Amino acid sequence: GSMSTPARRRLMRDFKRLQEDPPAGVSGAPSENNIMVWNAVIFGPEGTPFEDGTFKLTIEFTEEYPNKPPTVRFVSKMFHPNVYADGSIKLDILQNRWSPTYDVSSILTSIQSLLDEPNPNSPANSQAAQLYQENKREYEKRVSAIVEQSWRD
Amino acid sequence: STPARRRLMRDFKRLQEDPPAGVSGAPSENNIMVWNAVIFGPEGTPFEDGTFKLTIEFTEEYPNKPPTVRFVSKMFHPNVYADGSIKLDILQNRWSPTYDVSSILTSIQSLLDEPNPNSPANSQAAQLYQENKREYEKRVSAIVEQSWRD
Amino acid sequence: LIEEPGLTCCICREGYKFQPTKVLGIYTFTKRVALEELENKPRKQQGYSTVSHFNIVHYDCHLAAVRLARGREEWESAALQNANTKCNGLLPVWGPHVPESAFATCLARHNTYLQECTGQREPTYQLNIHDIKLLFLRFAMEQSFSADTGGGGRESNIHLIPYIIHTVLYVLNTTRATSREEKNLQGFLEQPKEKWVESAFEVDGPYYFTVLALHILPPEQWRATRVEILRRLLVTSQARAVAPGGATRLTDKAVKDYSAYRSSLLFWALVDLIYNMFKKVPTSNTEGGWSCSLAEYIRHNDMPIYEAADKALKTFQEEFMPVETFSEFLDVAGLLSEITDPESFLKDLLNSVP
Ligand SMILES: [Zn+2]
């Protein structure tokens, strides 16, 4: 697709970076035709209730990339204090604190590490934020439900 | 093929079908993004009988961003730096995607006749163009003769 | 496709290997300060001092990021691509295949940035030489670099030196102001020893002319002027120590503690190590003297300079800073081949000046 624009030229660079040196637990790739839409899977890291989960999410870029951040949402069902009800991720790096130096690899690692250590004081899901600090048993029980649900796709 | 290259092909057509008098450019045999043009010195000006050869470097951001127009033959002109690059409004600030290789080459030879010492690049040349016209055309003639070697 | 060896813009990850005509810039932070603190005048003569975390962006990539990010300041916006360390300027570098029309346009943009944060309309190269002088003094006096920005220290600002030097070389070469400062520098060297005490409290003192000599004197001319400049720097330390306000003649001509001479010796060492970085520069006979030969070397050797800068910082940080005696300084500096009497060289110098 020519890849003449500034974006795409960067998205190709993010692709080769994510292809030849992908972080552990995450893996992504653009659509076969439209490079402005990527599909990435984030495996649940160990030591957390998200383990053994195949969480899929889609990333949507514009031609303003990398000056403006991409819209990232979870396709798989997610129960996390920093994840809204429609897959939106309440993360500063993806919104106000977005740096034009961040690439797709740095976005996937920030979301991967967000599953291990959530940020409950700034909640997007009121139900998951209260369970992460109060009843650790119900939190890891509801997360195990979406781990089995991540297999249903 | 990219949008910049397909546009560069259109620039080659209008420069081969309607080539303005005093200029002649063409891309390199290998790279389409690197052009080489000649601008014959306008008649009635101190640059007469001069064959100044230039180079035009394009990027994939063409035609949204102007190319790198650079002189190869040595040039003593107020709006021409020492490395060949040109301080021209259409090549920097006031660039428009509606311009092409022909509109640039024509606007360059027009600058040889009508320089702009108000915002100069060669201070020694802009000083001679306004203060001592006799000496200004004496060094320009030395640049005309110098453009005949290789 | 491939990675870029040299300097890379952190936004588009591309450098000269794929965009050899796009200007690269260094995010800098400059603030309005006094040129000389020991100036006996009530209101100090004003200049500016700059620092950097040494983060690289294309000048177009910087504008594209701040333009698309409407609602926040341009320099509050650039902090995110500058490792969260605030900045207010973008020092341009002139690449080998970059047109002079593009570099001169970016240097004017950086000069306007300096006019805003420092209030100094028309930032001349003289003000820029003092900017290098004040940056050298931050190294020699162990001052903070991250105090006003939030990050970056000696490691960051040691790589800012060659390109901050470059803007002085560029103005000196286009405006043909080399010979004027050449004759102006030789006037400082030829100053009789009665003026030496008075010059230690002037703005264009021995520190400024040392930075100037770095820009217009070849390495061979430096080694000949090393000791003479060393004498003027040592007398500067004693003058500013025994009379921190002002003085015309040396009253206390007795050798003081090494802590009084340490600032000038590290200043001298930092300059000599930079000359060692540029020891491979062609001397002359190449369409210009030293300010031309050095400018082209800085222009074409971004990566050889980077390693030499880290090597120079290593020598400065490991060998020069821990020096405790003046005799040890001459050992590390290597001046024992031409200064055979270290004990007498000091006390005779402070006695040689009125
Ligand atoms: Zn860039």
Author numbering:
A (entry chain C): -1 to 151
B (entry chain D): 2 to 151
C (entry chain A): 4830 to 5183
The authors write:
UBR4 is a 574 kDa E3 ligase (E3) of the N-degron pathway with roles in neurodevelopment, age-associated muscular atrophy and cancer. Here we identify and characterize a distinct E3 module within human UBR4 consisting of a ‘hemiRING’ zinc finger, a helical-rich UBR zinc-finger interacting (UZI) subdomain, and an N-terminal region that can serve as an affinity factor for the E2 conjugating enzyme (E2). Via an allosteric mechanism, the UZI subdomain modestly activates the Ub-loaded E2 (E2∼Ub).
To determine the structure of this complex, we obtained crystals and collected diffraction data to 3.2 Å. A structure was solved by molecular replacement using the apo structure obtained from UBR4xtal, and a UBE2A crystal structure. As for the apo structure, the N-terminal ∼100 residues in the UBR4xtal construct were unresolved. The UBR4 molecule was equivalent to the apo structure (RMSD of 0.98 Å), except for the hemiRING loop connecting αA and αB, gaining structural order, suggestive of E2 binding having a stabilizing effect. Two UBE2A molecules are present in the asymmetric unit, where the first E2 molecule (UBE2A #1) binds the hemiRING proximal to the zinc coordinating fold, as observed with RING domains. Several X-linked intellectual disability (XLID) patient mutations within UBE2A cluster at this interface. Thus, the UBE2A #2 interaction is probably a consequence of crystallographic packing. The most notable interactions arise from UBE2A residues Arg7, Arg8, Arg11, Arg95 and Ser97. The guanidino groups of Arg7 and Arg11 hydrogen bond with the side chain of UBR4 Glu4843. UBE2A Ser97 side chain also forms an important anchor point by hydrogen bonding to the backbone carbonyl of UBR4 Ile4840, the side chain of which also makes hydrophobic contacts with UBE2A Pro98.
